[PDB]
């Protein structure tokens, strides 16, 4: 429905300097941040409407490109921490977690991916490669990054 694009095209002006930043993955608090990354997670089909991220949306994902019985570990662990924190924070806390875990390296690659594929740059079974890597950084060089 609405693309991360669409997301960066609310960001108040404080963020929008810094949205090589955030596209780096890079933590800023919010609630600022915290309303745009839930944006983006909700972009990406990551989160539920509160925000509470989405088990079953990451597992064979992630699993696809590292397998790793970590993985399943992590999504417990920060499902169960963005549960605890408000509906305004929470899918910002899940999307934190998840970078601080083991699972960062490969959250990160998924997300990329989920990023390209729902703007229709890369096709759906498009997977982590070296062309890959370049299409994204063309991609956030056209946005300045």
């Known amino acids: 429905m609405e693309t991360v694009q669409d997301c960066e095209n609310k960001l108040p002006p404080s963020l929008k300097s810094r949205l090589c930043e955030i596209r780096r993955y890079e933590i800023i608090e919010g609630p600022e941040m915290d309303k745009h990354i839930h944006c983006v997670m909700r972009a990406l089909d990551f989160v539920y409407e509160d925000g509470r991220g989405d088990y079953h949306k990451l597992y064979?994902?992630?699993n696809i490109i590292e397998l790793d019985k970590r993985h399943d570990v992590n999504l417990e662990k920060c499902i169960g921490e963005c549960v605890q924190v408000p509906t305004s924070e929470r899918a910002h806390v899940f999307y934190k977690?998840?970078?601080k875990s083991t699972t960062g390296r490969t959250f990160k690659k998924v997300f990329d991916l989920?990023?390209?594929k729902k703007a229709g740059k890369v096709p759906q079974h498009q997977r982590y490669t070296a062309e890959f890597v370049?299409?994204?950084?063309?991609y956030d060089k056209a946005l300045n990054c």
Do not use: H
């Open 60 to 62: 064979d994902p992630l």
């Open 97 to 99: 977690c998840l970078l």
């Open 114 to 116: 989920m990023e390209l």
């Open 134 to 138: 370049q299409i994204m950084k063309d």
